[PDB]
Every structure is written in C-alpha cells, then in structure tokens.
Design a protein around this ligand. Structure first.
Ligand SMILES: [Zn+2]
Ligand SMILES: [Zn+2]
Ligand SMILES: [Zn+2]
Lengths: 539, 83, 119, 191, 97, 99, 577
DNA sequence: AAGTCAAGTACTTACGCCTGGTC
DNA sequence: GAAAGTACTTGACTT
RNA sequence: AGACCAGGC
C-alpha cells in the first residue's frame, strides 16, 4: 500500500546503481549517464554513447570525457583493426569511485600514520595539500609549488613532500599504470608467440614454457615499477637537502591505505583474542614489515586470464612459493622492544603469542618468526563471518553454523543428537538458516532414481555463496543511506539555499539543526558498514 | 520529406480503381455533413448519386497525394488526371 | 500548444483600442447597433482604456517622437508615459529609475510641458 | 500587453466550407484561446494576424479539414516593475487586494513591503496610516514585483468523489507587488 | 528469395516475418508469446492480419494514399502591418547612443 | 450471440476473410469488424504504455500524457488476459499529422 | 483561470515484449488478497469482502458499486491486485529458457565462463546494424554450445559440469564425464566427503547413489542475483532497465486477474450464484501459500514442508498451462477417480480455434444481417437482389438529413414503423440516450427535425447490400448488389449468375450484410460491384453468362431451320424489351 | 579426451458454417 | 487407436 | 455459462 515501503526500488538494481549513485553526488546529470551506461553495457565506444541515450551529442561527451579522465574514472585503451582506421574503447575504471567513497578515510590514516612527528603544523599543512591532490586527480610538483605563497618558507610544505613519497602512499604518475589487466597481458603477450624464427617443430609444449616464463618476468618488472622505485623521489642535488623531482608528478595509491585497515581487522581479531599490550607488540612488527607485505595485493595475476584445472596449482603454488619466498626471506630478524612512545626483552610476550596459535598469530621458522599471509586469511574470514550471524540473529544461529562445518554433509539424525536440545526449535532455525542460501540443500534420493519426498537430506558447503550475500550488503545498505540523505537535501533545499546566503525566526533554526544531525549520523553509519564490507571482498 | 516538384514524376498518369473508391466515398461523406455543391443538382436524394454526378463534370476540389517507398512524397490533382 | 518564441516586438497600448475597434466593427459593434463569449475581453478592454484619457489622436502621436527621441530614457519608460500620470511633478518620478538624477533643473520640465501639450 | 508568436493545428468542419479560409480559421482560433490563460506566456486577450498557412490534410475516418498554422496572438503582462492603474475590491487582514477593471481581480498586494505604519483592524476599519488612508471604489496605482505560475491538476478519483459527496488554490495567473515608494494607492493626494 | 527453400509449414513459417501476433495467429499458442517476452523482442505493427487486431487502417489497396484538399488561400494578404510602435521606441535609443 | 430464442447474427470466417482482402478494400473492413460489432474507447499513456480508467494511469499519476482513442474490445480483453499472466505487451503511440 | 486543453490524433507503432519485474504489480495493486480460501462472504446478505473477489476488483452484477469508481458494469472495466507467494515458486513457460540461462553460467562463481576475444568477437557480431531474427537464434545457440566444451572456468576458483535437466519441473544438473582416471583437486575432497557418510551408516548410501546435484528454485534465484550489467546480451537479455534483468523469470509476486477475466456465472435457473474455475484456482493458492507462512517457524519439520512447496509449483503451472498438471501426481480424497478435462483455466481459453485468437478475435460477428433460402427470377437484372419487406422492416440503416432529405425524411417520421416507408429510430444532435419511435410520439416531433440529427430509415430501393454464401472458396464469393422490396419471403436473385456462389438452389442458405457509413457503402458498390467482377480473377475469362435453359433456348431461336413472321417477330421484339 | 556422424524417444495439428433437441 | 514431422540425449571414429 | 446428440450445405 502506497509503495512508500520502497519495494519499488528494491528488486531491480544489484551492483549497478551503486556507481551512478556516487558520481551523481559527485557531479550528477551527464556524469551519471555515461558511467551508468558504461557499467550496464560494459565496454563502450565514443560514438556509441551518442546512439543510445541521445545524450546532447558531442557537447556533453567531449566534456564528460576529459572530466572522467582527470579523476581517472574511465579505463582507457586504444588499438586498431586489420581493415584500418583506429578505435578507442573505455571501461569502468578499477574502483575509482570507491576512492570517492573513501576520501577523508584515506586522509584519516594519512594524518594518523604521519606520527613520529609529534602534533605539529603538519595538521593544517598536508591536509591542504592532500585535499588538493585527490580533488584535481593529478598533481604536478612545480605547478603545486607555484600555488604556495611567496616570501615565506617554501620547503616548509616541502618539509613534508619528500616525506609524502615516504614508503607507501603517494607515488609518481607513470604511463600505462591505468590499463585493463587483461589487455596489458595481451599486449605483453606479443613478442612471445611472435618470438620464433621458424625454430623447430619439436615439443609443442615448449611454446607454453617459452611464452609463459618470458611473460612472467616481463610482468614482474611492470607491476614492481610503480611499487618501489627510488630514482625520481630520492633525487638530491647540492645546495639543498633531499628534494623530490620538480618535473615528475605524483598520485595516491592502494598500497598502505588498503593495508592499514587490513591490519585493523587483524587487530580487532587480535585484541579480541589477547590483551591490549599483546596487540601493541604485534602491531609494531606489522608497521615495519608492511612495506614488503603483498597482502591486499595478493592475486595480481588472477584477473585477465585462465588459471587451470591441472596447472591451477602450478600457477597457484607458483604464487604460494613466492608467497613463501618474500615473507620468509626478506622480513625482519628478531628485534628487542624497538622504540615505542616492561623492561628487558619482550620476546616472552611473543612466546605467549607463539604457544597459542589457533586460529592465528606467530607460526614460525627456525631462527626467525613471522605470520604467513596465505593461511591467515581463511581464519580471518571465518571469525568475522561467524560474528556477522552472531550480531544478526540469536545465539542459536551461531551454534548451528559450525555444526555443519565440523564434519560435512550429514542428515538430521546425528544433527538432532549432536547439536543441542530441541527438535521443533531446531526446525524453526533450520528454516531460518536455510532461509537465505549458504547451506544450500543436499539432493540424494531414496530407493529411486528421482521420485518424491522422504529422500535423504544433508547440509553442506556454499562458501562463496555465503560470501556474496555480504556483497549484497555492500550497495543496498549504503544505497538508501546515501539516497535518502540526498533526498533530505532536495527536500530542505529551499532552506539550505537560505542558510548559504545568510552565511532569523524560531522554526527556521529548528530544521537547520535537524538536517545537520541526520547528516552527521548518516556518515557515521556509512563508514561503519564500510569497514565491514572491506574485509569481505577477499576470499 | 519535401515534395517532388510538379515538373517531373515517375508515377503513372492514370488513376487506380482503388482511388475512385475513396474519392466518391470521401466527397459523398462531406455531403452528409452539410457542405455545399459545385455542380448543378437535379431533384433527387442521397449523397452518393450526386457525388457520381459531381465527378462527371470533375468539380471535386481535391488533390490526391501518393507515397513512394523512400518518402519522396508527391502531388497530384484530380482535375488534371485523365481516364 | 507549441510556442515559437517568448516575446515578439514590444506592443504597448494604443492600437489595442484601434484594432479592437475592428473586432468591434465586425461583430455587432456594440453601443450603436444595440438599438460568442468574446464579450468578456471586449467590454473590458474598451472601458478601462478610454475612461482614463477622457477625465484619442492620429498624427500628434507620431509627432510626439521629437523630444521623446532626444531623451535617453530608453524603452521601459518610453511606452509607459503614454498613459499614466501626465505632466505633474512627482508623478513621472515613480515610473523611471534615476528620474530626477542626472539632469534636473530645466530639461525634465521640458517633459512636463510637452506631455501637458497632449490635451 | 505584448505580442506572442505561436503555432497550432486547426480543425475546420464542412459547414464552414462555403466561406473563406482566413475567416474560418479566425473564428476557430477565437474559440481556442480568447479569455483562456496560456501557460508561461501570460494571459491572452485577442488575435492579430495569420501567416505560413499551407495545404490542410485529411484523415480517412472523418472528412473534416485539418490545417497547421502559426499566428501572433495579443497577450498581457507589463514587465517586472511596471506601475499601472487599478483599484481594490475585497479585504481581510493580509494585505489589500487590487483589481483592474477590464482584465482580472488577480492582483493582490499583502502588507509586508508596504509602508511602515499600515495595519488592518477587525473593527471594520480597513487600513490606517500614521498620514491618511482609503478604501474600495477609489483608484489605486500599484507596482508589479512578483509573479507566480501553477498548473497542478492530477486529482484522484478517490480524492475527487470525496469532495463531491462531502459538499481553494486557484492561482492560474497571479501577480503581486510592492508599493513602498511614496505616492502609490491614490491619485488625488497629488494635484 | 531468402536463399534457401523453406515455407508454408509451422516449422518453416518462421523464417522472415518478425511479427509475433500473426505467427501466433495461424498456428501456435504458448511458445511464441513467452519466447518473444524472454528475448525481449520489439518488432512493429505493420502487416494486414496484424492491423485488423488493433483495429486500424490498412497500408494496401484503398489505404495506399492520403487524400488532401487545397486551402485556396492567397500568398499575398498574409503579411502583417505594424504602426506607431516600431517608430518611437527604437529610434529614440539609437540616436547618438 | 448465436442461434435462436435469444437473438441472431452472421459469421465472417477466416476463409471468407481473405476474400475482402483480395478486393483491396480497407474502408469496408474498418466499419464491419469494428463499428458494426464492438466499438470501444481506451485510455492510454504515451509513457509506460498501458491501460487505465478515466484520467488515471495508476502507477504514475499525471493525466497530462493520457491520450484517448478507439480500439476493438477483443484487443483490450486479450491485453487483460496476457498481462494477467506475466508478460508485458506495452503500447507506444505516434502522431499521424505533421507530415 | 480555466486553462486551455489540446488533443492530437495518435496511431500505433510497434510493441515491446518483456517481463514486468516486481515493481509494477504492487504499483498496479488496488487491494491485497490476504485472508485465505473462503470467498469471504459476509454472513448476512452474502456479499464478498476483500479476499479474491471483492467490492473493488471488478463487478459481476448490474448494481455492485465498485468503490474505486462508479457506474458499475457500463463504466468500470477492470482493476489489478497482487498476491504474496511464500518462497520463489518456479515458472512454467520460461522453464525451457531457464535451462539455457542456467547453462552458459558456471555455478561456482555464478558468472559467465567465456574468454576474452571470443566474447569480444560475438559482441561485435550482433551489433551489425541490420540483422534478421534468424541471426539472433543462430548466435544465441552458438554461444551456448561454446560453453559446453570448456571444462575450465577462467578467473574464479574451481569449476563444474553441465546441466541436462533430468526428471517434471525438476531441475537437476549432473556433474559428470570428469577426466578419466585423472585425479581432480575437487574430486579428492568429493570422495573424501562420502567417506564420512558411508562410515556412519554404510547401508543407505551404497543402496542408492549417483544422482549428482540439483538446483532449488530459491538458490538458483540467488544465483541470478550476482550477474548484473556486464553482458546479459549474450544471454538474450538487453537492459535499458525498466526491468531488473532475469531475476524476473521466477515467480515471487503474482497478478491476480480482475473479475472481467472471469465473472461469477449467474442465471441457469436456481436460487443462487455460481463461481468459475479460475476463481477456485487462486483462492486455493492463498491456502497452500499461507500454509508455509504459518509454518517454517512454530511447528512441523524439515521434509514435510518440502513436497508441499513442490506441490505449489504444480498448482501455478497447471493454473496458466495444460500438461504440467500431471507430473507423477494424483488427487486423493476417498480415492475414487480423477480425469476432469476442462479444468485448465488460462492457456486454453486463449488457445487457438474456438477460444480466443482465431475463432473469437478475427472470427467476429456481424450485426445488421439476415438469412433465408433461394429462388430464381428472370425479371431482375443482374446486380439487383430482391429483399422481402418483412425482413426489411427489421433491417435499418443510418441517415443524416442535410439540405435535401429534410423534405421526405420528415414525412418518413410521421409515417410510422408499421408500413414499409418509415423509421424505427431517431437521434438528436443534443445527444440524448436515443429516441425510439414505436411507443408513441411521432406527429409534432417531425416538425422540428434539426439538421444535425440522425434517423434510421427502413431498407428500400436504390441501396447497396453485399451478398454472401457461407462456404466461401474464392474471390468471387463476396459480391455486392442493389436491393429491392418484394412480397412473400425469400432471397431471390437473377439466374444469370449461379456461377460465383455455385448455387444449385435446392433450398440452400444465403448470408446478407448491409453497410453503415457512406464511405464503406460507396466502397462496396463502386469496387466490389458485380459489373467490375464480371471477369474471373485468375483465368481472365468471363465467369458469368447465360446457363442451361438460356443456352438451349437461344439455340432453338437462332436455329438454322426455324423461320418467323412479322407479327410473331413483333411480340418477340416486344418480349425482348 | 575433444570432435565426431549417426540413433531412440518425445512432441503439436490435421473442417467453413448453421439449426435443431437433451443433463 | 490417429500420422507426419521436428527436437532432443548417446555411440563408432578418429586424432 | 459450459455441455451433449441428430442433422442441414
Ligand atoms: Zn503512465
Ligand atoms: Zn472499477
Ligand atoms: Zn566461475
């Protein structure tokens, strides 16, 4: 009745509307059009935009194009055909809107981890700098330096610039860094099948080894190019201190921002399982070793090509061995209570972090101890997931979830016995558990091929389907959240315009405090479930 | 969209019997709606028989319009057409 | 229905009465032959218009341009002074912005004397 | 007053075939607008001239004549700030409502931007100034300020039949203004 | 003419015609209605048996042409006449400034 | 209806239907199979093409875009049949005039 | 006030076929079913309240105020309302296509399994500007047979097999034809899973096995909620997104039909009112639906509810279709017996021939008609057909009196609807109900008779009527003649033509149709007329001429032997004319 | 082990229209 | 019990 | 309303 229950919008926009919702708040109108269409139909051509919508031809497209490029909201690729001419195809770019869905959250960690400098002028300084970075979408150093006032300290803002290069965070602008992972692999795939001068028709399987191995080493140099390079940033001419290259520009990055929150999730699990001091001891390790830790960067070869059935492991364990290599080889030798803002050696507090392992924290090698980034994720997904059902439903829903996960695929016979207590309430919460997916249903017959009821039942599996249900939690929570926040704007729009011109009456101040209240609380709810989604996007 | 000039036409100069069906039908319908008549009327009844008489002297003030497949339009006057 | 433009060349009120005298002339021409639903605007226009200037002309209108040209008052005021509050002091002070303003002592009184040269 | 330029399609029956086109289209266009209010262009009074008229078409199911023509209609609106003669009609405590005999009573000036010392009384005395005042039947000069447009007729059958068996918002064309510049509201204060 | 010999039978009657109603007319019921909805077909109302459903005219025979009458109106008298408005107004502002 | 003791009528069959088609007469078919049998008017909106009562489109309340025309009763009944089951037989309209 | 109103003539261009998704039915919703079973008769005067049938849905009777609108039968047409179905009960018609949408997608990640340039090539193909419908089914087939051979999913996890749809309405996908004697990483877990089963109770699993894996309608619906945007185009679904993409091919809501679809059948004597089969269907649905609604929490168990929900997909399938009613199912009560044929309520009445599309829709009925036997006559010239005055009294025709008819038609009014030259009806331009002239009046009523009125005169000479024989064969069946008024009763026409109708007389039957508008009337005689139809459409030879006695009669007259005299030749010429 | 040409089983329609009595 | 055709899940034969 | 059977061309 009256449809105000929002059943109208409920069915028809999975994923999708997420993107063009955000960019609408960003810009709106034409900007939401192109991207929203770039999503729905996927790969898109310049002329193709005009055909579909009748979008105010060639005035809007050329305007939106450069607008999307500066903030790099479009993945760009150009090639040709055997017939002739040229073609330029655009893709929905990485997650760049998610960064627009981040903003201050990134700047948060930027300010908080800028410590080792104690409560300085930095707070107002780089906050002005970083806000100028993301907003413009690209920043050249000299033109940025030109914006700084004269007859003052020029290297005060450059006191932290060469400190902006730091370890992670801001890196240089490079070339094809924005590029489809599938396409760059195919572009690098040339000169490999292209390589042989009619060599010899022996061992066809050697064409495999040739192309692959040569592509892998050529892939490593490309992906590690943005990762760590000290050429541009560490330039140090005389008559000065170390100063970043005035020519080469910079850009923000996925590296330590996606890592910092990943450590938080580890801390949240840590702090749960140990004391506050132990969480700190494990923290100081992660802060130093986060540089060489792939973690969030893990698959990196996954998108853009096949894995295998047979050779899947020969791919997978090839990654697992280099996931064995770098953490084992490179990472820190044993230190003693490094600095920090309990005397002697704190390794004893590590040993209590050692002896107690399951699920995680401190599995070791002889002579050197470090936490694996491979086997760690499964127990990380376990915990958070079980806490989700814990928060959602009562304590009954918890206990049964693992009851299916101890052994696997069994009937109600040993379940009723081994679970807890009562049949009818179990059947109740069985239907509540089986309500939305995640246990599926088992299909095996009884004394027939396929006939009817009384066939035996079992409960099992569905790890990825019990994952994706938290990916539905991604958009539709934030959706109505941000939407009815935006609807709160246009409703009070006549007031807000009056407030802006004023920057009177008893009741005009009332609705001023009203919206502002709702605003502050709706952003606190946004970042809340934002932190929840971020952990669920992997495995 | 625009009409081909009166100068040149690819269409046959004669008229189809299907055309005669609508002409007599149209004009007679306007008679029942109380229009005037451009021809001398002997004492009689009905719109139909006075319509055939109206066509005999070709007093119909109508211009027949035809269409090609490409939309090159057309213009054809009843009076000029001959059978 | 479809509109081909906002506003065409500015039409003040003179020829309204003149060409609604044509609308008059055509249908029944009112008061004379007295011895649809167009009567709403018909009786309305002629009454409001004519009653003003009583308590008009042909040539002198077109000859009123002379000093009305040399004056820089532009447009909005131009066709406005045709009817409202002729020829006394603060009357014309209301219609035109910067009425007293620039030129005061004599030149604006030249407006008063000529618009008093109306009737 | 001002001259609008619009286009339109006209249906003339067989009954008008005996007369001339221009005379037939005239009467029809007069039945179209006349006193009716035209959206966003202001209020229209009469019709002026005829142009562009071309060959009319015919649909197989009627036998009438449909012609699409454009014409320039005489409409009404002075401009944002114009002063024009009129006089009041009704009243309450809001502000005075001035009506120009010959067009509409739609003009209404509430008291906000009016003079500092004016107020309504329930005493049946209309308005008072701190120096004199007036009432209906006396002429008033009023300046235009604000103009508003509405359409709003999606009335529900559920909602419509409600008002029918049970037993205002008419702002089709509405103008209002601010007279605070001295010398407004009566012409005999001068002279 | 399509380049392959087929036709006149329900299996062969779907070759060219994209009109779903006339094909569901001759022989079929359930399949064509659901199939056209699945693939989200559009097509058009064009043919004869298609038009007799929606109850409108025909594109062949008597309905192959459009009947039109002349307006007979002259091309001259249409021109408007403006007086006294375009004289005083513009010429006043255009002198010396 | 058909038969006797109620009232009578006649039948144009699909076999006979082709005959009047072969003559090429459009006008005769417009009168006979529509006006002579069942003549019905239906309110339809250009946007979200559907059917409604009076000036209300239900799901969208406008009354501004609603255009009223004529159409056989069998059509509307078929549409109310189709739409009852899940399928969308949407209708879109254009204008005859303006060239 | 009083703003202007405009109108424009509008034709029909095309249609758009698709599935309404979840938004529209609740938007078109007037009321909600709720309740259950039980037509919800108020127990006093026995009116319906809410439920399936209700004061506002549609109306089955002549009074019955609708309360959505007023004017009952002669005004109201129909209104829509929805129904809530516990769990996503499966579809019927889309089921064949539901296998295909479930085919090309890999179950693990629930995404398309194709690879790069393959997809890139096909996406370029269909976007070629001109395309035949045949090309659609050609590629959409191809793309679906391309995913058959590939045993390897690309970017996501592990993989699986094909879906062969084995059973009806039971979808089970067999993971099968795994690499022969080659250990899979998944198989090692697979066989390891069963080892923990056969350990506890070795009896049952070895007893019956190898049924592989199925897909529940609920979980395949949750499997359809992942893929959005990307490409649904290779799957046949284009998104301009009024519709929410193929999440709509599974029943969730439901469009409960108006009362204009099926009424409550009345009369047939008796002191009561009778429901119709389609009403019984959905009112039963609310029961078997709410059965799960009440359940699933408080009482019952796991495997009981199962077949009842499997019984639900049986009901809805039978509801809108035919042969899905008996997939290994029989109703018990007392036992006894089943086999009632007509129960099908939807796809049948809409089915071809008698029900809707052929018989009813293009098979419509002709008003203003007549039928009677045949009988010869020499005296009627061809294109003339004599119509008896007795059936000419009940056969009318519309006439609009203008400028001419004023004289005679006003005389026809005062004449009366008894004698032949009269009028049975009158219609004034002021739009009354109608004026039937039988009961009274006449007289003074003929004094006014304004021009814009309409009066129906009796059929008379000089009119146009088309003639027909029911077993139609060719173009020469339907013709058109002039009418006439003669005595007795019969349809008599010239013997010159027995050819086009193939008339042996013998007491056959002949159809009669009289046009209405002046347009169609002039169309019939000036085109379909006999004089123009004198020649056969095919051979180009005259199909009509003298026959039998006329032929042998002309022989003896022109016979070389016979002679005649002036007096005899005189009357013979006078017999000619 | 894909790619392969030839095999067993399962489906929708086969007559235009009318005029009578019977459950 | 209609007969006529068309469409849909499996084996030799290769590589 | 949905049914039947006989029979007509
Ligand atoms: Zn609508
Ligand atoms: Zn109703
Ligand atoms: Zn997959």
């Amino acid at each position: 009745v009256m449809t105000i229950s929002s059943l109208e919008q409920r069915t028809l926009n999975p994923d999708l509307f997420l993107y063009k919702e955000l960019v609408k708040a960003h810009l709106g109108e034409r900007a939401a059009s192109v991207i929203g269409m770039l999503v729905a139909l996927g790969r898109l051509s310049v002329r193709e935009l005009v055909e579909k919508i009748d979008g105010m031809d060639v005035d809007s497209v050329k305007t939106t194009l450069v607008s999307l490029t500066q903030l790099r909201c479009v993945k760009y690729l150009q090639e040709t055909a055997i017939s002739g001419k040229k073609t330029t195809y655009y893709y929905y770019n990485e997650e760049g809107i998610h960064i627009l869905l981040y903003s201050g959250l990134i700047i948060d960690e930027i300010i908080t981890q800028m410590r080792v400098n104690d409560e300085e002028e930095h707070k107002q300084l780089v906050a002005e700098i970083v806000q100028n970075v993301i907003s413009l979408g690209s920043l050249t150093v000299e033109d940025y330096l030109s914006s700084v006032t004269s007859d003052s300290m020029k290297y005060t803002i450059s006191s932290l610039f060469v400190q902006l290069c730091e370890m992670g965070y801001l890196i240089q602008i490079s070339k094809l860094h924005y590029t489809p992972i599938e396409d760059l692999w195919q572009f690098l795939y040339e000169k490999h099948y292209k390589n042989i001068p009619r060599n010899s028709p022996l061992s066809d399987l050697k064409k495999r080894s040739q192309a692959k191995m040569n592509a892998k080493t050529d892939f490593a140099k490309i992906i590690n190019k943005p990762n760590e390079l000290s050429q541009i940033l560490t330039v140090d001419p005389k008559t000065s201190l170390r100063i970043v290259k005035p020519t080469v520009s910079l850009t923000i990055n996925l590296d330590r921002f996606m890592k910092g929150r990943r450590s938080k999730q580890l801390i949240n699990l840590a702090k749960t399982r140990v004391g506050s001091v132990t969480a700190q001891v494990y923290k100081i390790a992660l802060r130093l070793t986060e540089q060489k830790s792939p973690k969030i960067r893990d698959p990196l070869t996954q998108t853009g090509l096949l894995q295998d059935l047979e050779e899947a492991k020969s791919f997978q364990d090839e990654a697992e061995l280099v996931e064995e290599k770098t953490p084992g080889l490179t990472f820190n030798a044993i230190d003693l209570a490094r600095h920090l803002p309990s005397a002697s050696l704190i390794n004893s507090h590590l040993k209590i972090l050692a002896s107690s392992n399951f699920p995680f924290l401190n599995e070791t090698k002889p002579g050197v101890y470090y936490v694996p980034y491979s086997k760690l994720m499964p127990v990380l997904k376990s915990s958070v997931y079980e806490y989700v059902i814990a928060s959602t439903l009562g304590p009954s829903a918890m206990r049964l979830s693992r009851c299916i996960r101890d052994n696997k695929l069994v009937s109600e016979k040993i379940i009723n016995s081994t679970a807890l207590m009562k049949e009818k309430d179990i059947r109740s919460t069985l239907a509540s558990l089986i309500r939305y997916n995640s246990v599926e249903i088992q299909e095996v017959p009884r004394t027939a091929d396929r006939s009817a009821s009384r066939a035996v039942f079992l409960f099992r599996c569905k790890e990825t389907h019990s994952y994706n249900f938290m990916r539905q939690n991604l958009e539709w929570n934030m959706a109505n959240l941000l939407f009815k926040k935006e609807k709160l704007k246009q409703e009070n729009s006549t007031l807000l315009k009056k407030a802006n011109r004023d920057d009177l009456l008893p009741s005009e101040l009332n609705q001023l405090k009203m919206v502002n209240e709702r605003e502050l609380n709706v952003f606190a709810r946004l970042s809340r479930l934002l932190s929840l989604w971020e952990v669920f996007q992997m495995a | 969209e625009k009409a081909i000039p009166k100068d040149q036409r690819a269409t046959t100069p004669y008229m189809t019997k299907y055309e005669r069906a609508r002409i007599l039908g149209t004009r007679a319908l306007q008679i029942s709606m109380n229009a005037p008549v451009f021809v001398d009327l002997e004492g009689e009844t009905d719109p139909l028989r006075i319509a055939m008489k109206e066509l005999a002297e070709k007093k119909i003030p109508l211009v027949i319009r035809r269409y090609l497949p490409d939309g090159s339009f057309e213009d054809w006057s009843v009076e000029e057409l001959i059978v | 229905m479809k509109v081909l433009e906002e506003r065409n060349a500015f039409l003040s009120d003179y020829e309204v009465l003149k060409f609604l005298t044509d609308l008059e002339k055509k249908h029944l021409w009112d008061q004379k032959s007295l011895a649809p639903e167009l009567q709403g605007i018909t009786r309305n226009v002629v009454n409001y218009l004519s009653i003003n200037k009583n308590f008009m002309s042909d040539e002198s209108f077109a000859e009123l341009m002379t000093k009305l040209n040399s004056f820089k008052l532009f447009k909005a005021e131009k066709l406005q002074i045709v009817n409202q509050l002729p020829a006394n002091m603060v009357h014309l002070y209301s219609i035109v912005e910067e009425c007293d303003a620039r030129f005061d002592e004599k030149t604006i009184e030249e407006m008063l004397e000529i618009i008093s040269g109306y009737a | 007053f001002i001259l609008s330029k619009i286009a339109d399609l006209v249906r003339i029956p067989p009954d008008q075939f005996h007369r001339d086109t221009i005379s037939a289209i005239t009467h029809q266009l007069n039945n179209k607008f006349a006193n009716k209010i035209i959206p966003n262009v202001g209020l229209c009074i009469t019709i002026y001239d005829l142009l562009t008229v071309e060959e009319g078409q015919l649909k197989p199911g009627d036998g009438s004549s449909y012609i699409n023509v454009t014409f320039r209609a005489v409409v009404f609106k002075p401009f944002l700030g114009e002063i024009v003669t009129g006089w009041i009609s009704k009243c309450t405590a809001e502000g005075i409502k001035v009506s120009l005999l010959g067009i509409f009573d739609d003009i209404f000036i509430p008291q906000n931007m009016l003079f500092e010392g004016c107020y309504y009384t329930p005493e049946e005395s209309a308005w008072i100034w701190p120096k004199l005042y007036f009432d209906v039947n006396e002429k008033i000069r009023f300046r235009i300020e604000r103009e508003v447009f509405v359409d709003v007729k999606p009335k529900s059958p559920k909602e419509r039949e409600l008002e029918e068996r049970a037993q205002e918002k008419p702002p089709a064309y509405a103008l209002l203004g601010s007279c605070q510049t001295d010398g407004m509201g009566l012409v005999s204060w001068w002279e | 003419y399509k380049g392959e010999v087929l036709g006149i039978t329900r299996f062969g009657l779907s070759k060219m015609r994209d009109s779903v109603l006339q094909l569901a007319s001759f022989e079929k019921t359930t399949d064509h209605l659901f199939d056209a909805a699945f693939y989200m077909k559009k097509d058009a109302v064009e043919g004869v048996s298609e038009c007799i459903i929606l109850g409108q005219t025909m594109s062949i025979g008597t309905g192959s042409f459009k009947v039109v009458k002349g307006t007979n109106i002259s091309e001259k008298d249409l021109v408007p006449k403006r007086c006294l408005f375009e004289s005083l107004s513009n010429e006043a502002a255009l002198k010396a400034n | 209806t058909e038969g006797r003791s109620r009232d009578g009528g006649l039948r144009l069959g699909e076999m006979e239907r082709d005959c009047v088609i072969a003559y090429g007469a459009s006008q005769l078919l417009l009168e006979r199979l529509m006006i002579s049998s069942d003549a019905f008017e239906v309110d339809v909106c250009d946007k979200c093409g559907l059917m409604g009562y009076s000036g209300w489109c239900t799901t969208c309340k406008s009354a501004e875009n609603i255009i009223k025309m004529t159409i056989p009763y069998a059509a509307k009944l078929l549409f109310q049949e189709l739409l009852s089951m899940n399928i969308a037989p949407r209708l879109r309209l254009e204008d005859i005039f303006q060239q | 006030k009083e703003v202007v109103v405009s109108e424009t003539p509008k034709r029909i261009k095309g249609l758009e076929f698709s599935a309404l998704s979840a938004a529209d039915i609740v938007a078109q919703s007037e009321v909600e079913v709720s309740t259950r079973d039980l037509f919800d008769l108020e127990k006093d005067r026995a009116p319906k309240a809410n439920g399936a049938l209700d004061p506002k849905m549609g109306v089955s009777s002549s009074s019955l105020e609708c309360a959505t609108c007023h004017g009952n039968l002669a005004s109201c047409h129909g209104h829509f309302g929805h129904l809530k179905l516990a769990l996503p009960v499966f579809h019927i018609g889309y089921f064949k296509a539901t296998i295909q949408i479930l085919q090309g997608i890999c179950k693990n990640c629930s995404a398309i399994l194709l690879s790069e340039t393959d997809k890139r090539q096909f996406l370029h193909e269909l976007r070629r500007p001109g395309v035949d419908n045949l090309r659609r089914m050609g590629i959409l087939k191809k793309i679906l047979d391309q995913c058959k051979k590939q045993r390897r999913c690309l970017h996501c996890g592990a993989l699986n097999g094909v879906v062969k749809k084995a059973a009806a309405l039971k979808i089970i996908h067999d993971t099968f034809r795994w690499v022969g004697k080659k250990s899979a990483p998944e198989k090692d877990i697979w066989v390891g899973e069963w080892k923990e089963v056969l350990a506890h109770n070795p009896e049952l699993e070895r007893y019956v096995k190898r049924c592989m894996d199925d897909l529940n309608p609920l979980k395949t619906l949750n499997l359809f909620k992942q893929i959005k945007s990307a490409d649904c185009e290779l799957l046949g679904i284009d998104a301009t997104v009024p519709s929410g993409r193929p999440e709509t091919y599974i029943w969730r809501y439901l469009p409960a039909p108006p009362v204009c679809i099926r009424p409550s059948v009345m009369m047939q004597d008796s002191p009561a009112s009778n429901e119709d089969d389609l009403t019984v269907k959905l009112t039963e649905i609310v029961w078997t639906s709410s059965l799960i609604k009440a359940g699933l929490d408080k009482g019952i168990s796991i495997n009981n509810m199962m077949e009842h929900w499997d019984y639900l997909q049986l009901t809805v399938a039978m509801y809108i279709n035919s042969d899905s009613v008996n997939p290994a199912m029989l109703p018990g009560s007392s036992n006894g017996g089943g086999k009632v044929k007509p129960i099908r309520g939807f796809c049948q009445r809409l089915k071809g021939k008698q029900g809707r599309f052929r018989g009813n829709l293009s098979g419509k009925r002709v008003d203003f008609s007549g039928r009677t036997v045949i009988s010869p006559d020499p005296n009627l010239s061809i294109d003339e057909v004599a119509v008896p005055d007795r059936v000419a009294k009940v056969l009318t025709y519309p006439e609009k009196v203008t400028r001419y008819n004023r004289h005679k038609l006003q005389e026809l009014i005062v004449n009366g609807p008894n004698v032949h030259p009269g009028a049975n009806y009158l219609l004034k331009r002021n739009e009354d109900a109608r004026r039937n002239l039988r009961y009274g009046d006449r007289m003074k009523l003929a004094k006014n008779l304004q021009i814009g009125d309409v009066v129906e005169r009796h059929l008379e000479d000089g009119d146009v009527v088309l003639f027909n024989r029911q077993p139609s064969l060719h173009r020469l069946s339907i013709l058109s003649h002039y009418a006439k008024i003669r005595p007795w009763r019969t349809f008599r026409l010239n013997e010159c033509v027995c050819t086009p109708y193939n008339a042996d007389f013998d007491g056959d039957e002949m159809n009669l149709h009289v046009p209405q508008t002046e347009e169609a009337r002039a169309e019939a005689i000036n085109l379909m007329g006999v004089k123009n139809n004198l020649l056969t459409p095919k051979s180009g030879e005259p199909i009509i001429a003298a026959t039998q006695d006329f032929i042998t009669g002309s022989y003896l007259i022109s016979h070389k032997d016979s002679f005649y005299d002036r007096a005899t030749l005189t009357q013979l010429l006078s017999m000619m004319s």
